[PDB]
Amino acid sequence: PKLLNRLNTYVGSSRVGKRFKLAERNSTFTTELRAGTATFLTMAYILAVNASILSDSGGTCSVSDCIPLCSNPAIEPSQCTGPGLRLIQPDVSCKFNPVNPGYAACVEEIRKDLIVATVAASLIGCVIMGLMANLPLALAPGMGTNAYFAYTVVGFHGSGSISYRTALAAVFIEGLIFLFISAIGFRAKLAKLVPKPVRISSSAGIGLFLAFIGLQNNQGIGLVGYSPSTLVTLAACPASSRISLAPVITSANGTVSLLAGGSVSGDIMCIHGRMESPTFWLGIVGFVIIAYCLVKNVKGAMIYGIVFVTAVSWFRNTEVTAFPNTSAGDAAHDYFKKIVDVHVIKHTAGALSFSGINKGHFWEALVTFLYVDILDTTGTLYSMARFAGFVDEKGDFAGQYFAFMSDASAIVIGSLLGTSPVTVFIESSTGIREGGRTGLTAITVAVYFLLAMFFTPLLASIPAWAVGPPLILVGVMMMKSVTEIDWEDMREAIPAFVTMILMPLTYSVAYGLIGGIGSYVVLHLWDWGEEGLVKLGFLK
Amino acid sequence: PKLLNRLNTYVGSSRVGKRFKLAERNSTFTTELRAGTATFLTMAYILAVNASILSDSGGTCSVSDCIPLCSNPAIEPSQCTGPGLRLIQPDVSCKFNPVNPGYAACVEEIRKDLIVATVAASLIGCVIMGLMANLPLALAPGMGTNAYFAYTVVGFHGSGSISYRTALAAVFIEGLIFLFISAIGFRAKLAKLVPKPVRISSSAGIGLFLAFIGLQNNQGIGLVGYSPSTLVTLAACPASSRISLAPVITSANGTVSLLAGGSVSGDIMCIHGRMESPTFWLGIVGFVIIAYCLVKNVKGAMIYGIVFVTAVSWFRNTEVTAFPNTSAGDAAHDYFKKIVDVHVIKHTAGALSFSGINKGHFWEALVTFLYVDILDTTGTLYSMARFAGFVDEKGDFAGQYFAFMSDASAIVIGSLLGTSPVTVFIESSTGIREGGRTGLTAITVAVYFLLAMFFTPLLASIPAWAVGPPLILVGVMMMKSVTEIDWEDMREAIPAFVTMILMPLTYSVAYGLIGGIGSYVVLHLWDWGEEGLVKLGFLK
Ligand SMILES: *[C@@H]1O[C@H](CO)[C@@H](O[C@@H]2O[C@H](CO)[C@@H](O)[C@H](O)[C@H]2NC(C)=O)[C@H](O)[C@H]1NC(C)=O
Ligand SMILES: *[C@@H]1O[C@H](CO)[C@@H](O[C@@H]2O[C@H](CO)[C@@H](O)[C@H](O)[C@H]2NC(C)=O)[C@H](O)[C@H]1NC(C)=O
């Protein structure tokens, strides 16, 4: 007969076929391969997004890599010898606008390291899940945790309260704690502490957070800029129409004096030319492409949008180029002209530090990660077990124990390689809908990730207006959880609204969670006291 | 027979009782009075909120009221005569921080004028509705239109693109157009142009906008401040820990130079002492009070929260005082020591100007108002007609014609007195639930508004941390519209999300509407073209 039939029969009757229980689950070999291909096509946008987001945090390097500069910018630093010409020693301000050249070079090196680390963590997680749990699930660094890790815990170019290495240690300890909790069966009971309205709306809140990042110049397409009155207005003017802000001291007559050592922002204020940014309109075109591909059920919509926007930007002498006519642009183009490369992680691997373990901020991060991974992983896996028909009458699908242990182990391993926590992707559903039932789907996704490695030069050249619409559409899709909040009941509607709006406005996830929980406790104090009084016996 | 029974019988058998159809609708006199009292108690927060919001726009006065200042702030301006001491002529920067004393005095005068105008517009609208339509509905200046009029169309202290008088003319013409449209029966047809997902989510969007205003230092309790990296972080530090920002020019070596004539912001950047602002915690206490009063179905919850927070602030030598130890504070206290006053509108009444009618921004405002009033009034009235049992099998409740004409006339009259458009309040439902069926409820609310006049000194002394939680809770209650969007369908979910998130982030309502409509058209182009091709006959 057909050669595929012979191959399927041979594999099913073999020893590895019985190991993976192919016959008992009604799927042979090619259904597994097709399901793995579909899942990889649906989740491949993480390869660009995660590396960009994590690289924005600055990585391991610090002020020690800034180089001394000349008195005038027109003279090369090594030729700054003459009357009144001296070398300026670097300070913290070298990390921020205008950025010192050495810092930017290090940041590019960190970006390559983080691409490789993302690929390796996804591969190891998928293989561990496939071999141990024997489930068709794919693991990769999560999205909300990426944004929270980069822009809040560590901050832009290390402007946060915790260094990169200490945050890696926090992720490591969180993974170990999650493993220990899942191994003794206290995970389900611990999941009950979070009140219901906070437990749901939080997801929506994160989506809003992500969307806001996509509407930002540092991070996405623009369209939102600084305003002296309202703090936020309509941006998206060309890069030559933007200026920075600096703190000043005023008086009661009208004088102003610049404040020494103050933080200078990026080019966030727009003077003229609104709605004229070419990169903004290129990002809009990519957004439209992804949205149409999502409506018509095309797999890999985000891949297509990102690839279109990136390929348009690879030309050199345009207004939307990714390789500007500078030294950094020329170096980036030179690395890009190499199509394939085998990059070895140099700075990011094995970069843990336990110095800040006694700080109060550290723990605020460690708990927050622990919350998200406990909820998300609990929410996703069971949902997946419903699509594959594994759930019995008791609500258990056998391999849940090893599924949770494998997720925790993947988190630990990813922390060792220098990336944000890894989780199970919801996109795995698209593989289950195609017929994947065993762990061969995870192995197939792992092989695809291995082949996605070796393309670091192509993945390291993706501009900010290409990582923009994917975040917005991810927020759109996360928004669907609001339909199960009872907005008629104030005692539920107030905490959910507080969580949802505080996540993007304070630009933090922990603050939204804290506000929601505090509001819930305050609003339920009276009822709890009345119940306690009735129970004790002072009241009827 | 009790005396109340005799009074009810006498009124019901009288001529005015037959005029208002008291007997035919099963309500006599005291049910009408009680329903009016309940409605007024539920809607009385507008008396403070609307005046504060509209006064933040600066009113009619301009740079011409700034007074010349001395070379040093320590010398009184009229004694600035000596070596090198001159008078600085005012410029536009006198309107912004630091604010010229004459401008602040004028703004206080405008605040009194706007309190009186708000009361008068509400009274006239209620009387016109009660006498003509004969419905138990109360009219007052709307909330989203207040915020849009003040902070977007006119801008803070006149920093927008349209002056106050031109915006009043826009409101006037919008009211006239709405009257003409409703009189010829094209209102229902015109209401169908807005796509459904935009037509719903817009309400939720406005709520978010309002909540953001309540989390702002200019406008509410604080908690959200400027950030050099993310533009927005956790504020709410004491007023002595805040500094301003000014635009600068950088170079490639590290120098910075202040830019001449740039806009200086308010005290928005926080250096230290986060979560230590006493006014922030007072606002939180007021928020909690209103939240419990809302949970337990207490009428006038917002009144109680506002009154508590305001009464705490009336003491003079504290950190939460509304009368600081300055000249402006002393003048405010002197006006407050008067309990009752008869204020006559001096600047705001009859201040229309038709100069900017050929500007493109003008029309962008005029349409936007016209949208909101067409939707909101259509959404509310019919809903009210369901609670009172007026809707027949055909969907009409007889007096809808005069109801819409009365709403339009009230809009025009309010525009003449110098306020944002007036609409029907949803809070009127609380009066219908109590038994109100005729127009005597509107007359009762009008009498209550008339007696609420004469208390301008008390209403003019309400601080910003008292107008804060009401806006947040109004946003919470408007948020309930999201449950009727199908978030599973991308072709609907994308426009709704775009509208909802663009309203508060760009800090404008028109931009959210434009984005939503544009996204809807773009996403439906392919389907519309395919349908048209099938209809014409080129396709099967
Ligand atoms: C960096 O280079 C600029 C010149 O490009 C220096 O600016 C001097 O000081 C102000 C501010 O720009 C200018 O008005 C002067 O014209 C500049 N003087 C000269 C001789 O160019 C700036 O001083 C340099 N940075 C430092 C720390 O010296
Ligand atoms: C306005 O008032 C200040 C004093 O309050 C005057 O003095 C200046 O103070 C700032 C610091 O706040 C210094 O940077 C300036 O060097 C001071 N200038 C002088 C001449 O002493 C200030 O001069 C006043 N401004 C004007 C235009 O008169």
mmCIF file of C-alpha atoms in Angstrom, chain B residues 106-356:
data_model
loop_
_atom_site.group_PDB
_atom_site.id
_atom_site.type_symbol
_atom_site.label_atom_id
_atom_site.label_comp_id
_atom_site.label_asym_id
_atom_site.label_seq_id
_atom_site.Cartn_x
_atom_site.Cartn_y
_atom_site.Cartn_z
ATOM 1 C CA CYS B 106 -10.153 84.694 38.050
ATOM 2 C CA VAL B 107 -10.352 80.895 38.166
ATOM 3 C CA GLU B 108 -12.015 81.091 41.583
ATOM 4 C CA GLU B 109 -14.556 83.579 40.214
ATOM 5 C CA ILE B 110 -15.232 81.199 37.312
ATOM 6 C CA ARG B 111 -15.745 78.350 39.784
ATOM 7 C CA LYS B 112 -18.508 80.264 41.560
ATOM 8 C CA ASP B 113 -20.116 81.165 38.226
ATOM 9 C CA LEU B 114 -20.034 77.528 37.120
ATOM 10 C CA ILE B 115 -21.635 76.280 40.342
ATOM 11 C CA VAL B 116 -24.547 78.653 39.798
ATOM 12 C CA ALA B 117 -24.796 77.755 36.100
ATOM 13 C CA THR B 118 -24.858 74.019 36.860
ATOM 14 C CA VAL B 119 -27.704 74.450 39.345
ATOM 15 C CA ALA B 120 -29.690 76.674 36.974
ATOM 16 C CA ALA B 121 -29.296 74.348 33.984
ATOM 17 C CA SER B 122 -30.379 71.321 36.015
ATOM 18 C CA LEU B 123 -33.415 73.198 37.355
ATOM 19 C CA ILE B 124 -34.585 74.424 33.951
ATOM 20 C CA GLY B 125 -34.069 71.017 32.351
ATOM 21 C CA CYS B 126 -36.025 69.220 35.068
ATOM 22 C CA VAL B 127 -38.923 71.685 34.876
ATOM 23 C CA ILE B 128 -39.095 71.502 31.071
ATOM 24 C CA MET B 129 -39.053 67.693 31.167
ATOM 25 C CA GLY B 130 -41.731 67.519 33.857
ATOM 26 C CA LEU B 131 -44.142 70.000 32.296
ATOM 27 C CA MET B 132 -43.886 68.909 28.646
ATOM 28 C CA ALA B 133 -43.162 65.171 28.534
ATOM 29 C CA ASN B 134 -44.837 64.408 31.899
ATOM 30 C CA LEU B 135 -42.213 61.827 32.830
ATOM 31 C CA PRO B 136 -40.404 61.176 36.141
ATOM 32 C CA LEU B 137 -36.940 61.917 34.758
ATOM 33 C CA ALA B 138 -34.203 64.220 36.044
ATOM 34 C CA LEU B 139 -31.772 66.122 33.817
ATOM 35 C CA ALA B 140 -28.292 67.376 34.691
ATOM 36 C CA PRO B 141 -24.914 67.935 33.000
ATOM 37 C CA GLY B 142 -23.459 64.590 31.983
ATOM 38 C CA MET B 143 -20.206 63.197 33.287
ATOM 39 C CA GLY B 144 -18.208 61.887 30.335
ATOM 40 C CA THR B 145 -19.054 65.046 28.418
ATOM 41 C CA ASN B 146 -17.794 67.105 31.374
ATOM 42 C CA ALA B 147 -14.412 65.397 31.330
ATOM 43 C CA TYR B 148 -14.134 65.470 27.532
ATOM 44 C CA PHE B 149 -15.118 69.155 27.383
ATOM 45 C CA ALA B 150 -12.678 70.235 30.077
ATOM 46 C CA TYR B 151 -9.540 68.134 29.611
ATOM 47 C CA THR B 152 -9.588 67.500 25.845
ATOM 48 C CA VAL B 153 -11.503 70.125 23.856
ATOM 49 C CA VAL B 154 -10.464 73.155 25.918
ATOM 50 C CA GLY B 155 -7.581 71.591 27.843
ATOM 51 C CA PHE B 156 -6.122 72.374 31.239
ATOM 52 C CA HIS B 157 -5.938 76.166 31.686
ATOM 53 C CA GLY B 158 -6.714 76.630 28.011
ATOM 54 C CA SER B 159 -3.888 74.426 26.739
ATOM 55 C CA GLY B 160 -6.154 72.769 24.161
ATOM 56 C CA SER B 161 -6.778 73.675 20.539
ATOM 57 C CA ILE B 162 -10.194 75.347 21.012
ATOM 58 C CA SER B 163 -11.088 78.215 23.326
ATOM 59 C CA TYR B 164 -13.864 78.056 25.914
ATOM 60 C CA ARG B 165 -16.258 80.317 23.994
ATOM 61 C CA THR B 166 -15.846 78.378 20.747
ATOM 62 C CA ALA B 167 -16.550 75.136 22.620
ATOM 63 C CA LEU B 168 -19.714 76.712 24.026
ATOM 64 C CA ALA B 169 -20.748 77.574 20.465
ATOM 65 C CA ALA B 170 -20.091 73.963 19.452
ATOM 66 C CA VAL B 171 -22.366 72.719 22.248
ATOM 67 C CA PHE B 172 -25.041 75.223 21.177
ATOM 68 C CA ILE B 173 -24.991 74.071 17.549
ATOM 69 C CA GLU B 174 -24.959 70.415 18.617
ATOM 70 C CA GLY B 175 -28.094 70.983 20.682
ATOM 71 C CA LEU B 176 -29.820 72.719 17.778
ATOM 72 C CA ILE B 177 -28.892 69.885 15.396
ATOM 73 C CA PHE B 178 -30.129 67.269 17.872
ATOM 74 C CA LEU B 179 -33.434 69.131 18.211
ATOM 75 C CA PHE B 180 -33.902 69.313 14.440
ATOM 76 C CA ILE B 181 -32.973 65.645 13.960
ATOM 77 C CA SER B 182 -35.365 64.456 16.669
ATOM 78 C CA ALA B 183 -38.224 66.609 15.368
ATOM 79 C CA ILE B 184 -38.288 64.906 11.933
ATOM 80 C CA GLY B 185 -37.835 61.314 13.093
ATOM 81 C CA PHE B 186 -34.357 60.697 11.665
ATOM 82 C CA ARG B 187 -32.775 60.136 15.093
ATOM 83 C CA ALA B 188 -33.459 56.386 15.116
ATOM 84 C CA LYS B 189 -32.130 56.013 11.566
ATOM 85 C CA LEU B 190 -28.974 57.980 12.371
ATOM 86 C CA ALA B 191 -28.380 55.881 15.497
ATOM 87 C CA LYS B 192 -27.737 52.853 13.247
ATOM 88 C CA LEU B 193 -24.513 54.107 11.635
ATOM 89 C CA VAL B 194 -22.305 53.249 14.618
ATOM 90 C CA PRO B 195 -21.215 49.581 14.510
ATOM 91 C CA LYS B 196 -22.436 47.508 17.432
ATOM 92 C CA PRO B 197 -19.098 46.606 19.129
ATOM 93 C CA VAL B 198 -18.064 50.272 19.054
ATOM 94 C CA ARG B 199 -21.524 51.335 20.250
ATOM 95 C CA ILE B 200 -21.210 49.221 23.418
ATOM 96 C CA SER B 201 -17.556 49.216 24.453
ATOM 97 C CA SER B 202 -17.434 53.011 24.115
ATOM 98 C CA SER B 203 -19.395 53.294 27.353
ATOM 99 C CA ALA B 204 -16.843 51.118 29.142
ATOM 100 C CA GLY B 205 -14.064 53.159 27.569
ATOM 101 C CA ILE B 206 -15.443 56.382 29.007
ATOM 102 C CA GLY B 207 -15.564 54.752 32.423
ATOM 103 C CA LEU B 208 -11.884 53.890 32.228
ATOM 104 C CA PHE B 209 -11.150 57.465 31.176
ATOM 105 C CA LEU B 210 -13.005 58.801 34.204
ATOM 106 C CA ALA B 211 -11.229 56.415 36.559
ATOM 107 C CA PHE B 212 -7.855 57.533 35.232
ATOM 108 C CA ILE B 213 -8.793 61.142 35.992
ATOM 109 C CA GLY B 214 -9.588 60.076 39.541
ATOM 110 C CA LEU B 215 -6.095 58.609 39.959
ATOM 111 C CA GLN B 216 -4.354 61.863 39.040
ATOM 112 C CA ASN B 217 -2.897 64.639 41.172
ATOM 113 C CA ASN B 218 -4.516 67.473 39.209
ATOM 114 C CA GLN B 219 -7.898 65.832 39.512
ATOM 115 C CA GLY B 220 -8.104 63.145 42.200
ATOM 116 C CA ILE B 221 -6.100 61.416 44.917
ATOM 117 C CA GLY B 222 -2.735 60.887 43.214
ATOM 118 C CA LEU B 223 -1.222 57.378 43.114
ATOM 119 C CA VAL B 224 -0.140 57.821 39.473
ATOM 120 C CA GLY B 225 2.871 59.942 38.583
ATOM 121 C CA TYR B 226 5.421 60.594 35.874
ATOM 122 C CA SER B 227 8.146 58.043 35.182
ATOM 123 C CA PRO B 228 11.208 58.689 32.970
ATOM 124 C CA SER B 229 11.193 55.075 31.696
ATOM 125 C CA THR B 230 7.561 53.913 31.571
ATOM 126 C CA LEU B 231 5.879 57.376 31.711
ATOM 127 C CA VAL B 232 3.662 56.199 34.591
ATOM 128 C CA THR B 233 4.401 54.709 38.013
ATOM 129 C CA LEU B 234 3.205 54.730 41.614
ATOM 130 C CA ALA B 235 2.913 58.305 42.949
ATOM 131 C CA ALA B 236 1.190 59.529 46.149
ATOM 132 C CA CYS B 237 4.075 61.145 47.982
ATOM 133 C CA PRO B 238 3.623 64.412 49.909
ATOM 134 C CA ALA B 239 3.456 67.667 47.974
ATOM 135 C CA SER B 240 6.943 68.586 49.219
ATOM 136 C CA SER B 241 8.452 65.528 47.474
ATOM 137 C CA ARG B 242 7.283 66.457 43.963
ATOM 138 C CA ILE B 243 9.184 68.279 41.208
ATOM 139 C CA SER B 244 8.422 69.507 37.693
ATOM 140 C CA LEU B 245 9.813 68.627 34.263
ATOM 141 C CA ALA B 246 11.138 70.834 31.467
ATOM 142 C CA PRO B 247 12.182 70.019 27.888
ATOM 143 C CA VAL B 248 15.897 70.048 27.072
ATOM 144 C CA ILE B 249 18.289 69.548 24.155
ATOM 145 C CA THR B 250 21.037 66.924 24.408
ATOM 146 C CA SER B 251 24.131 66.063 22.389
ATOM 147 C CA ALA B 252 26.402 63.061 21.833
ATOM 148 C CA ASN B 253 28.893 63.849 24.628
ATOM 149 C CA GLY B 254 26.647 64.436 27.652
ATOM 150 C CA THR B 255 25.639 68.102 27.768
ATOM 151 C CA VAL B 256 22.056 69.292 28.306
ATOM 152 C CA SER B 257 20.537 72.720 27.638
ATOM 153 C CA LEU B 258 17.111 73.996 28.660
ATOM 154 C CA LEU B 259 14.797 74.780 25.739
ATOM 155 C CA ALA B 260 13.432 78.326 25.673
ATOM 156 C CA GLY B 261 9.671 78.749 25.892
ATOM 157 C CA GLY B 262 8.903 75.105 26.623
ATOM 158 C CA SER B 263 5.890 73.987 28.626
ATOM 159 C CA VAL B 264 6.631 73.249 32.283
ATOM 160 C CA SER B 265 4.484 70.555 33.860
ATOM 161 C CA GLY B 266 2.966 70.502 37.328
ATOM 162 C CA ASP B 267 4.481 68.729 40.314
ATOM 163 C CA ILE B 268 4.251 65.265 38.777
ATOM 164 C CA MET B 269 7.626 63.574 39.446
ATOM 165 C CA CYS B 270 8.189 61.947 42.836
ATOM 166 C CA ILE B 271 11.666 61.677 44.357
ATOM 167 C CA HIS B 272 10.925 59.990 47.697
ATOM 168 C CA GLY B 273 8.240 59.242 50.261
ATOM 169 C CA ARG B 274 5.955 57.059 48.155
ATOM 170 C CA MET B 275 2.699 55.903 49.779
ATOM 171 C CA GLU B 276 3.060 58.614 52.426
ATOM 172 C CA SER B 277 0.651 61.293 51.180
ATOM 173 C CA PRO B 278 -1.966 62.084 53.866
ATOM 174 C CA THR B 279 -4.482 63.350 51.294
ATOM 175 C CA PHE B 280 -4.164 60.057 49.412
ATOM 176 C CA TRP B 281 -5.147 58.117 52.536
ATOM 177 C CA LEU B 282 -8.011 60.502 53.291
ATOM 178 C CA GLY B 283 -9.256 59.874 49.758
ATOM 179 C CA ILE B 284 -8.945 56.133 50.349
ATOM 180 C CA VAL B 285 -11.100 56.458 53.476
ATOM 181 C CA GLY B 286 -13.745 58.301 51.464
ATOM 182 C CA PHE B 287 -13.571 55.618 48.772
ATOM 183 C CA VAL B 288 -14.159 52.882 51.365
ATOM 184 C CA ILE B 289 -17.114 54.770 52.859
ATOM 185 C CA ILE B 290 -18.774 55.118 49.450
ATOM 186 C CA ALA B 291 -18.035 51.463 48.649
ATOM 187 C CA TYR B 292 -19.820 50.113 51.732
ATOM 188 C CA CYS B 293 -22.693 52.528 51.265
ATOM 189 C CA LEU B 294 -23.061 51.234 47.693
ATOM 190 C CA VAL B 295 -22.899 47.569 48.726
ATOM 191 C CA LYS B 296 -25.644 47.961 51.354
ATOM 192 C CA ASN B 297 -28.008 49.877 49.023
ATOM 193 C CA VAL B 298 -27.787 53.208 50.858
ATOM 194 C CA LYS B 299 -29.092 56.154 48.855
ATOM 195 C CA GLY B 300 -26.687 59.058 48.523
ATOM 196 C CA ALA B 301 -23.478 57.088 49.054
ATOM 197 C CA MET B 302 -21.360 59.542 47.072
ATOM 198 C CA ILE B 303 -22.842 62.452 49.020
ATOM 199 C CA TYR B 304 -21.716 60.847 52.267
ATOM 200 C CA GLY B 305 -18.187 60.115 51.075
ATOM 201 C CA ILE B 306 -17.717 63.584 49.591
ATOM 202 C CA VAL B 307 -19.143 65.283 52.684
ATOM 203 C CA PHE B 308 -16.940 63.312 55.078
ATOM 204 C CA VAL B 309 -13.750 64.017 53.127
ATOM 205 C CA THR B 310 -14.663 67.692 52.702
ATOM 206 C CA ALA B 311 -15.608 68.239 56.353
ATOM 207 C CA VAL B 312 -12.315 66.731 57.506
ATOM 208 C CA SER B 313 -10.499 69.194 55.221
ATOM 209 C CA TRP B 314 -12.237 72.323 56.542
ATOM 210 C CA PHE B 315 -9.838 72.673 59.486
ATOM 211 C CA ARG B 316 -7.043 75.100 58.797
ATOM 212 C CA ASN B 317 -3.699 74.050 60.329
ATOM 213 C CA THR B 318 -3.431 70.425 59.148
ATOM 214 C CA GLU B 319 -1.767 68.590 56.269
ATOM 215 C CA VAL B 320 -5.120 67.862 54.588
ATOM 216 C CA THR B 321 -6.526 71.391 54.764
ATOM 217 C CA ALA B 322 -8.435 73.074 51.957
ATOM 218 C CA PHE B 323 -7.419 76.561 53.185
ATOM 219 C CA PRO B 324 -3.610 76.792 53.199
ATOM 220 C CA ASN B 325 -1.766 79.600 54.979
ATOM 221 C CA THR B 326 -1.448 81.812 51.897
ATOM 222 C CA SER B 327 -3.360 84.773 50.487
ATOM 223 C CA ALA B 328 -5.542 82.588 48.261
ATOM 224 C CA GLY B 329 -6.256 80.263 51.174
ATOM 225 C CA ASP B 330 -7.235 83.176 53.404
ATOM 226 C CA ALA B 331 -9.572 84.584 50.750
ATOM 227 C CA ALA B 332 -11.143 81.147 50.287
ATOM 228 C CA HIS B 333 -11.659 80.820 54.041
ATOM 229 C CA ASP B 334 -13.208 84.294 54.182
ATOM 230 C CA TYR B 335 -15.705 83.355 51.474
ATOM 231 C CA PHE B 336 -16.385 80.034 53.226
ATOM 232 C CA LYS B 337 -17.187 81.747 56.542
ATOM 233 C CA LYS B 338 -20.290 83.056 54.801
ATOM 234 C CA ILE B 339 -22.682 80.116 54.987
ATOM 235 C CA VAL B 340 -25.271 81.291 52.438
ATOM 236 C CA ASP B 341 -24.890 83.636 49.486
ATOM 237 C CA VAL B 342 -26.827 84.756 46.417
ATOM 238 C CA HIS B 343 -24.285 84.695 43.584
ATOM 239 C CA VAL B 344 -25.013 86.316 40.214
ATOM 240 C CA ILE B 345 -23.294 84.910 37.132
ATOM 241 C CA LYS B 346 -20.902 87.539 35.791
ATOM 242 C CA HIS B 347 -18.528 86.015 33.218
ATOM 243 C CA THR B 348 -19.943 82.689 32.030
ATOM 244 C CA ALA B 349 -23.477 83.566 30.891
ATOM 245 C CA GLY B 350 -23.900 84.568 27.253
ATOM 246 C CA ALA B 351 -20.262 83.957 26.322
ATOM 247 C CA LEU B 352 -20.617 82.282 22.923
ATOM 248 C CA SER B 353 -18.222 83.002 20.063
ATOM 249 C CA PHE B 354 -18.499 81.795 16.463
ATOM 250 C CA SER B 355 -14.941 82.668 15.408
ATOM 251 C CA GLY B 356 -13.513 79.159 15.082
#
